[PDB]
Design a protein around this ligand. Structure first.
Ligand code: G82
Ligand code: G82
Lengths: 181, 181
């Protein structure tokens, strides 16, 4: 648990930001170059608020699998000269299962807060927000509004992004290496 | 930072609880025997709600120094057969200063959340909530309502209990070994 927290803190410091869209406030994880990720329901427009700053969105892909089914992730290209530290090496080729994970949030609401969520299990199918959704990772923690975009990690691994909950369990969309080339 | 988180998680698991009083919801740290601590402003009555459960308060000391000055801590004797694990060994004889601390919260609002608050400095005097108050530990973190009772820790050390903030800094009352005999 210790090293997983240490890893999470350094990842949030280097690669994470607080984002506001017309749809609420989110944690945002920068991945490589100028590409970052939000939950698809953040519904980012032409311009987002990133650490209170008007940033232009050059391009935005809502992710779907081979059937055209929703993965609940939007990739965003940001109009800024700073490049993110490339964290593709920390992203698995397939859904990861883990016994201890930490969920990391960085919003006005939950500023630099870290949650030990316990066991993460692959949960693949889930009817999320009414929508059938694949590649969900599940943890038994009472997750709330304001936590979306939260980054789920274990030692040296970025597992997924928090996208929903049913009041008793939370679910991350798996953040897979092939989404980023 | 890793071992401090590991220490904090195990301390909250063993010794902490969520308490509701007429004055709000708090994190509560059990110390030894049947004695626990809240911020004095929790203003615990004859009966508190402890993890949703009606618990009787046998005795309650609001703490003050030698001048009769407020320390912003209430010690509570609880009417329950379970004794807390004795954590007096983790309590310093005087105010502790540290470069990395973790603040741990356990409420409905902030369930099992851990915050790396950075440097803790002894701050002794502060006019808190209008009231002159001594033995304050300071950290530069945007602490909010709902975080009172939060437990401030470093590796193998319980430093104090979170009792206030001014929107930019937070302050813990130092939890000193001599308060508990
Ligand atoms: C993040 C929002 C955020 O950060 O706020 C910005 C300020 C939310 C976290 C969730 C909500 C409750 N707990 C959480 O961890 N995420 C959501 O709100 C998403 C949003 C969304 C929108 C559109 C399409 C897809 C996703 N939705 C859910 O988590 C969803 C909402 C259901 C719900 O409780 O809210 C109401 C108000 C609409 C009723 N949860 C869900 O579908 O799971 C329930 C379920 C599970 C299994 C089978 C059937 C239903
Ligand atoms: C914990 C409350 C909680 O858990 O809610 C239960 C559901 C609060 C955390 C604080 C509040 C804001 N940020 C925090 O970290 N703590 C308090 O509210 C305490 C309460 C209290 C009451 C009576 C006597 C002593 C303490 N008070 C403060 O933190 C205090 C409040 C000032 C304030 O901003 O609130 C208003 C609404 C009353 C204006 N803060 C304070 O005095 O510091 C300001 C200051 C610093 C230095 C010099 C002069 C003023």
């Amino acid at each position: 648990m210790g090293p997983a927290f240490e890893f999470a803190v350094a990842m949030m410091k280097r690669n994470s930001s607080t984002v506001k869209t017309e749809y609420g406030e989110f944690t945002m994880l920068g991945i490589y170059d100028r590409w970052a990720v939000l939950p698809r329901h953040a519904k980012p427009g032409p311009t987002i608020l990133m650490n209170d700053q008007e940033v232009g969105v050059l391009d935005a892909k809502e992710l779907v699998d081979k059937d055209g089914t929703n993965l609940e992730l939007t990739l965003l290209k940001l109009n800024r000269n700073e490049k993110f530290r490339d964290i593709r090496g920390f992203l698995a080729k397939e859904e990861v299962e883990v016994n201890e994970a930490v969920l990391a949030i960085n919003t006005s609401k939950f500023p630099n807060m870290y949650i030990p969520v316990g066991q993460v299990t692959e949960y693949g199918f889930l009817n999320l927000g009414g929508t059938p959704t694949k590649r969900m990772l599940m943890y038994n923690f009472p997750t709330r509004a304001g936590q979306c975009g939260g980054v789920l990690m274990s030692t040296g691994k970025v597992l997924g992004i928090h996208v929903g909950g049913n009041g008793h369990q939370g679910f991350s969309a798996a953040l897979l290496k092939h989404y980023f080339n």
